[PDB]
Symmetry: C3
Subunit: 181 residues, 3 copies
């Protein structure tokens, strides 16, 4: 029942547009065959720090790329310095990776492969205000960058018209997925 | 318990939407003490709901998992029980620990009013995982009476948005939890 | 531990929206190491918010769970602690539940550098819920962590319930169940 996280109060640790322009808070907890996750994002500087209807595109991507031992690769948008188990860098986390059987890397109707199953899509709310919806898309194992064995990708965006600019500062989002091990 | 009861993570067609085995229901239930953590997704592979558009009616269908008092799946369920089993093909004998509580979610003076909302979980899912293709899911606990079931988990799937260009009914994954019987 | 803190299976009203015992809160918190897994639902049985429509204002109300530094529920909470205990002890109240409290590091109590900007969204979880569980009857829920200062609380979990859709025919404020998780204090 271990937890792999960014630490709960991270310094800027994540690239949206430029290095460390945002704070990703991400906690993964192993509940046997499923991982329970909570994620939130605050963009602190740059193009997406304060958004409005003039900003385009209205979506950006945060990639976590892992090798076959579940170690985060430096090509990830997330900086690995404080990505570790909750209390030395960790050696292995295959247990926390999204399953390549449930969520295979991209490649008879019984052989139709689902396009939806490897994604989780919901609204989040900017500043936690019910009248400031945006969206999150979590994707498992959809990346090919850096020859990753596994990947978790967060697409953040919005669609509602905001004429008065507001911080891109998401409510916390809970999700779960089938673990590799 | 941290045990998992599931369809297997990559099932063959295993579920009836319109006809038998016309879809692949991926469902994993993991026991976290007396709450179950669940993840569900649906891919309809053949028949009326494989490719939907505004001309298909009705725009909602029901998938019932019906259990006896040992938590064993009854064959009247929409889900085929052949590979519904604990993660580890001998069929399991007991899974009451994974059933929705009949105290928190009973089968159907202001102080004595009973909640109709609490046995349901309702949310959007997104076909193909695209933010512009919403559909919906309703998870219902213990609301079936079919086959003298002692427990039930029902998944209602549907959509409301107009889709003139047809799209596969291929849901994003949906997470939920519920109070376990024991 | 892997225990559960919940509203106990007594069927009486256990919560105050507007007046004492006008509502029935269902909440279960289950500890998964450093994360809490939760499910919450609310039925208002009497008073202003039992049956709602567009002529009811405001369209939001708040249910506060306030805890001391041992994780014990304070009597200033909207939830009547008569009905709040570990699931198992019927007459023995719990002494300690710090492990179920929302982290004050992840979710600090409210109080120049952009890099030191404090997230306003992170301590909230916001979603639709659906009245009666009907897909055409959306309402909303806002779960907030540690944002209260009432009663010198050490920790808090606040549920704001409301709705925005225009309703002509009155409908019971009877929410679908909502799952969420949060980072635990320890
Ligand atoms: C009017 O449209 C919206 C909006 O974009 O603002 C849609 C918005 O719903 C979504 C999914 O974006 C809704 N928010 C929630 C969490 O219910 C939101 C609220 O229901 C609404 O702002 C609440 O208003 C009142 C009267 O309390 O309404
Ligand atoms: C126009 O309304 C909709 C739609 O039917 O497409 C509603 C849709 O929201 C819902 C609850 O269906 C929304 N998707 C999400 C995940 O929020 C979706 C997104 O806001 C929109 O597609 C995103 O647009 C941009 C500019 O990225 O907008
Ligand atoms: C027309 O707008 C709405 C509504 O307010 O009723 C928006 C409503 O969505 C939201 C986010 O409120 C939607 N329900 C769901 C769960 O997606 C809902 C359903 O798609 C719609 O009611 C579907 O109709 C039936 C009965 O199948 O449509």
């Amino acid at each position: 029942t271990r937890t792999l996280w960014t630490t709960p109060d991270p310094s800027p640790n994540c690239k949206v547009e430029t290095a460390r322009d945002s704070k990703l808070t991400l906690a993964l907890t192993k509940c046997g065959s499923q991982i329970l996750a909570t994620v939130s994002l605050l963009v602190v500087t740059g193009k997406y720090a304060i958004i409005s209807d003039t900003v385009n595109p209205k979506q950006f991507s945060i990639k976590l790329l892992f090798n076959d031992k579940g170690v985060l690769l430096s090509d990830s948008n997330l900086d690995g310095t404080y990505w570790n188990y909750r209390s030395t860098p960790y050696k292995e986390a295959v247990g926390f990776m999204p399953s390549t059987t449930a969520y295979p890397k991209p490649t008879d109707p019984d052989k139709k492969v689902s396009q939806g199953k490897n994604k989780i899509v919901s609204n989040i709310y900017l500043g936690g205000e019910v009248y400031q919806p945006g969206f999150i898309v979590v994707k498992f194992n959809q990346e090919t960058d850096a020859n990753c064995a596994y990947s978790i990708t967060f697409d953040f965006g919005w669609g509602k018209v905001y004429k008065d600019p507001i911080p891109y500062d998401t409510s916390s989002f809970t999700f779960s997925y089938i673990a590799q091990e």
